[PDB]
Amino acid sequence: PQITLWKRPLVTIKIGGQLKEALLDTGADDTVLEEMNLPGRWKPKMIGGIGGFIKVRQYDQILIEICGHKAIGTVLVGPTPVNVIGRNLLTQIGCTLNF
Amino acid sequence: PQITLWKRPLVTIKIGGQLKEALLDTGADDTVLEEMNLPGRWKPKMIGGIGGFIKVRQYDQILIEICGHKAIGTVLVGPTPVNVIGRNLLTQIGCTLNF
Numbered sequence: 001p002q003i004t005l006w007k008r009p010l011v012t013i014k015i016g017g018q019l020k021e022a023l024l025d026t027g028a029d030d031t032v033l034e035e036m037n038l039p040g041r042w043k044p045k046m047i048g049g050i051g052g053f054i055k056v057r058q059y060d061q062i063l064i065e066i067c068g069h070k071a072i073g074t075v076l077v078g079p080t081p082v083n084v085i086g087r088n089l090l091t092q093i094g095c096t097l098n099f
Numbered sequence: 100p101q102i103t104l105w106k107r108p109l110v111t112i113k114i115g116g117q118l119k120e121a122l123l124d125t126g127a128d129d130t131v132l133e134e135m136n137l138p139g140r141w142k143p144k145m146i147g148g149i150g151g152f153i154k155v156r157q158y159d160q161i162l163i164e165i166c167g168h169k170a171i172g173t174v175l176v177g178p179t180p181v182n183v184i185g186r187n188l189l190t191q192i193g194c195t196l197n198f
């Protein structure tokens with residue numbers, strides 16, 4: 001689809017078999033989701049945002065479907081203010097900016 | 100133009116008679132720029148993201164040019180680690196997400 005930006009670009013995603021709402025975030029390098037149960041291994045990671053750094057759990061090669069488009073990639077799970085889909089997955093679904 | 104997201108979507112902006120580099124950021128409600136001593140009045144504000152909140156100065160009705168596209172709106176100025184063009188200005192330049 002083509003999404004304008006008068007509202008937040010929130011979409012429905014499916015991860016771990018569960019549906020959630022997430023923000024398409026071209027300013028995020030990585031995909032960061034609020035605390036949740038996900039199956040499999042994980043590694044402690046640190047990531048930095050506008051306000052400082054937080055500790056997250058890094059899940060690799062995770063299946064995730066964004067607005068009907070499949071991705072398989074790294075998902076960080078931790079105390080983010082909102083679920084953000086970052087460029088690591090936006091590229092997978094063929095997302096570009098246009099003006 | 101069309102901007103792919105393999106790398107950060109960095110563009111040149113002109114604000115306050117100065118050229119700077121900033122990210123086209125669909126996850127940013129507002130526009131947040133590095134410390135700059137703009138003229139005129141301002142109002143204190145706090146904005147939060149990953150890692151918490153930072154203190155910024157809110158300037159209204161500021162002229163900004165983004166890849167030759169003119170806009171006018173609110174800019175938040177403070178110790179942000181990155182300059183972001185948020186949705187308040189991205190809508191004015193006709194920017195969409197597409198996949």
Ligand SMILES: CCOP(=O)(COc1ccc(C[C@H](NC(=O)O[C@H]2CO[C@H]3OCC[C@H]32)[C@H](O)CN(CC(C)C)S(=O)(=O)c2ccc(OC)cc2)cc1)OCC
Pocket residue numbers: 023025026027028029030031032047048049050051052053081082084086124126127128129130131146147148149150180181183185
């Ligand atoms: C202290 C750490 O230092 P750092 O690594 C941080 O460098 C950043 C910070 C913020 C952003 C924009 C946001 N991206 C971000 O956090 O990305 C994370 C996730 O992937 C990583 O890549 C970039 C930093 C990781 C996101 O796009 C916008 N945010 C809101 C979103 C989290 C819901 S925001 O910036 O917190 C914000 C903007 C406008 C607002 O108006 C009210 C409110 C809040 C990009 C790069 O840089 C050193 C020079």
